[PDB]
């Protein structure tokens, strides 16, 4: 069974679903696994009999692990990761002292190293929002007792071997959600963890597994078999009418590495008439992340704790401009709402198709798709005939900043509109390179008075500079002053970015003048750049950057006209 079909199968019926989390899931919770516990025990014992400093040598080192394992093999102990080893080393270290064994197992799996990850939190959310009612997990430490309690905010009824008959009563009286530990909490003496204790099953809990088998279907994750009592309970559990109504998928992180007992167990169930399926869904965390993703109408209150990254942190406010102040190149566009034109097409259209129609027709208007057009209707009639046009109406953009941030098409459209507006009534030529718009001093009109201030900006030692011309050592390359103008969405504001550049008349032959572009820009220091930016502000706006609110409209003689207003003074902020 493929994983996606299993997800649909679960999503299709997750209301009635027992979970059977093994010790594998707690692997991520940060709790030491079974192998980590075994290695800690060997290291704890090896250092005491052979007097060696405990903290001097670590445990996850390869050399120390090999040395300790060689020592263990020297005394005839089991060789490597073999059965009857974990219980063997426990009973060796603690020499049949179940109180001390319990205390150590509590300390190793204590509730201070546990950091809940997405898997346990998602399962606890499923418990609270009441899709899964029974969670039997052969674990010990309360990764979920903690995690569902933290996200739901309500305490969880954990069941164990100290009572062990609570689960059957709670199941019978429908006191969901129930979280019955088949091997019990470590706070309680019954722990059921050594191999001799792992051959028997508690009568009342075993009874509960069978009664719960009929009511729900089982999903077991992070469980690799190797336990005889749980396997025989499931087999007994499998041996009943509609044992798993929705079927049982034994999920494993890897089908290839799954033990034959499971696959043997899965094949065994199928012969008894149940629809048990073995699937691979990767790790438990990824499985539960996907399951939560497919969950519909998840409450916001619990989802604010399930996925803390979903909520937006670091909303740290900025202080006031009170009390040297950098002067950036950002002109704030205080326009909040604009009007655009919409055309309805009888057939669906593609933004590429509209772009090629722009290239062919070359109208005196702007258009984009989302089809929002800015300009005159007759231009659109030239672009689109009456047959393909259903209606032409109006569009209002109440929040320009949110609109451009949401859709990049709106960003490009508004950038092109403001660029056309700024260069509508001025002699400065408008070009494009890559997707950046450039306002460049024209070659012929370089002697204008409105450029003279710019001529002062580039001048050396206060004399008259040059604005346009030919490269010193180029055959045909022509150069001019220019400004790259862009639209930047910052927070809830829109700004115009101006950057002084040296435009080259041939587009593809810019690199041949690189040295010149370098040479002309070697000494454009803070004062010179300040002067050039002021001159460009004056050219583009017509007013000096003091207390100005110049307003510019694109296509003023058109029915659909956009009227922007940009402060003539660039952004500044005095130091605190």
């Amino acid at each position: 069974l493929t994983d996606n079909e299993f997800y649909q199968h679960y999503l299709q019926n997750s209301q009635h679903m027992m979970w059977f989390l093994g010790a594998g899931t707690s692997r991520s919770a940060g709790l030491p696994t079974a192998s980590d516990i075994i290695w800690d025990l060997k290291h704890r014992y090896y250092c005491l009999h052979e007097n060696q400093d405990y903290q001097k040598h670590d445990i996850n080192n390869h050399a120390i692990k090999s040395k300790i394992q060689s020592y263990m093999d020297s005394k005839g102990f089991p060789l490597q990761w073999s059965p009857e080893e974990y219980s063997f080393y426990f009973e060796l270290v603690f020499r049949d002292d179940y109180e001390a064994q319990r205390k150590y197992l509590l300390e190793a799996l204590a509730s201070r190293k546990v950091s809940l990850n997405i898997g346990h939190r998602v399962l606890a959310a499923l418990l609270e929002m009441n899709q899964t009612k029974v969670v039997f997990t052969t674990n010990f430490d309360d990764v979920i007792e903690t995690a569902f309690s933290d996200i739901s905010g309500k305490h969880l009824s954990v069941y164990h071997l100290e009572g062990s008959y609570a689960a059957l009563s709670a199941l019978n009286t429908e006191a969901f959600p129930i979280y019955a530990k088949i091997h019990g909490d470590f706070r309680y003496q019954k722990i059921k963890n050594l191999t001799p204790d792992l051959q028997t099953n508690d009568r009342e809990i075993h009874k509960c597994f069978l009664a719960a088998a009929i009511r729900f279907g089982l999903v077991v994750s992070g469980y690799s078999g190797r336990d005889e009592n749980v396997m025989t309970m499931l087999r007994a559990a499998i041996d009943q009418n509609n044992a798993f109504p929705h079927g049982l998928y034994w999920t494993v992180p890897s089908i290839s590495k799954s033990e034959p007992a499971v696959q043997d167990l899965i094949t065994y169930a199928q012969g008894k008439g149940v629809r048990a399926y073995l699937v691979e869904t990767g790790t438990f965390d990824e499985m539960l992340s996907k399951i939560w993703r497919q969950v519909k109408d998840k409450p916001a209150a619990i989802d604010a704790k399930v996925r803390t990254a979903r909520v937006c942190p670091v909303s740290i406010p900025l202080p006031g401009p009170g009390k040297p102040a950098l002067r950036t190149n950002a002109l704030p566009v205080v326009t909040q709402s604009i009007r655009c034109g919409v055309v309805t097409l009888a057939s669906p259209i593609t933004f590429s198709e509209l772009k090629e129609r722009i290239s062919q027709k070359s109208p005196k208007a702007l258009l984009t798709y989302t089809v929002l057009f800015l300009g005159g209707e007759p231009e659109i009639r030239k672009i689109f005939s009456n047959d393909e046009i259903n209606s032409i109406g109006q569009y209002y953009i109440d929040e320009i900043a949110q609109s451009v941030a949401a859709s990049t098409f709106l960003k490009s459209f508004v950038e092109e509109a403001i660029l056309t507006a700024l260069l509508r009534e001025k002699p400065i030529l408008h070009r494009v390179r890559h997707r950046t718009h450039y306002a460049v001093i024209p070659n012929a009109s370089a002697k204008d008075d409105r450029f003279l201030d710019l001529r002062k900006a580039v001048g050396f030692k206060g004399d008259l500079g040059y604005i346009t011309g030919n490269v010193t050592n180029a055959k045909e390359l022509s150069w001019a002053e220019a400004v790259s103008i862009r639209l930047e969405e910052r927070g809830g504001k829109l700004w115009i970015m101006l950057k002084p550049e040296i435009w080259i008349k041939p587009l593809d032959r810019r690199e041949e003048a690189t040295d010149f572009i370098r040479s002309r820009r070697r000494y454009r220091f803070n004062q010179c750049s300040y002067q050039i930016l002021d001159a460009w502000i004056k050219i583009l706006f017509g007013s000096i950057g003091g207390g100005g609110t110049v307003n510019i409209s694109c296509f003023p003689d058109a029915e659909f006209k956009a009227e922007f207003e940009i402060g003539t003074r660039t952004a500044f902020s005095l130091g605190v």
Binding site: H57, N61, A63, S66
Partner: protein, 206 residues
């Protein structure tokens, strides 16, 4: 290269030092071409056995002591290697010896701790005319932070009549060993150091 002829003549004279120096001068044609070859294969014929071993002199020992400061390995081959019966035994021996002398590492201790240095001190007898001379030298087999592992020996030094290093000499050789270990591991202390001496440690030596 060819062994210079006078060596054969000094073979009759029974002068070990002269024979070793003549062999070194024979190999002197290889001093300039150190980059071309990695391992030299000096062969000592059975006819030179008269100077192979005699009181106070060891031919292979003298040859290697003369060639080591020149930094060129030799794998001396006598008639023995071409005198046995099992060819695979000698072939394994020479192949491993040559590969390790070139600069390679045929094998390394699996999961060896890089923070432990295993010192080993031994000694040798020189039968002086008036008394005895005890030559004590140390060796280290530590594993550096890299993947390869090191194995370096050095003298413990002016005159010793007993094989027990005093306070000063032992403190000095162990400080030199500590500096040697520090140089490889960026400067980290050896957490535990193991010392294997052929004789008991004195109270001052500990």
């Amino acid at each position: 290269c060819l062994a210079l002829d006078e060596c054969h003549g000094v073979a009759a004279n029974g002068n070990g030092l002269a024979l070793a120096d003549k062999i070194v001068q024979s190999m002197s044609g290889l001093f300039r071409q150190k980059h071309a070859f990695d391992v030299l294969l000096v062969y000592l014929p059975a006819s030179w056995k008269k100077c192979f071993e005699y009181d106070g002199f060891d031919l292979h020992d003298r040859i290697k002591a003369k060639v080591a400061p020149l930094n060129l390995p030799i794998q001396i081959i006598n008639d023995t290697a071409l005198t046995r019966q099992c060819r695979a035994n000698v072939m394994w021996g020479v192949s491993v010896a040559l590969y390790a002398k070139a600069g390679g590492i045929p094998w390394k201790l699996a999961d060896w701790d890089k923070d432990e240095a295993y010192i080993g001190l031994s000694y040798a007898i020189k039968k002086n005319a008036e008394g005895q001379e005890y030559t004590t030298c140390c060796s280290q087999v530590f594993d550096p932070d890299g993947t390869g592992f090191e194995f370096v020996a050095y003298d413990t030094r002016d005159r010793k009549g007993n094989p027990y290093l005093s306070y000063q000499e032992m403190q000095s050789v162990l400080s030199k060993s500590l500096h040697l270990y520090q140089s490889s591991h960026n400067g980290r202390m050896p957490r535990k150091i193991f010392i294997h001496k052929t004789t008991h440690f004195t109270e001052d030596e500990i």
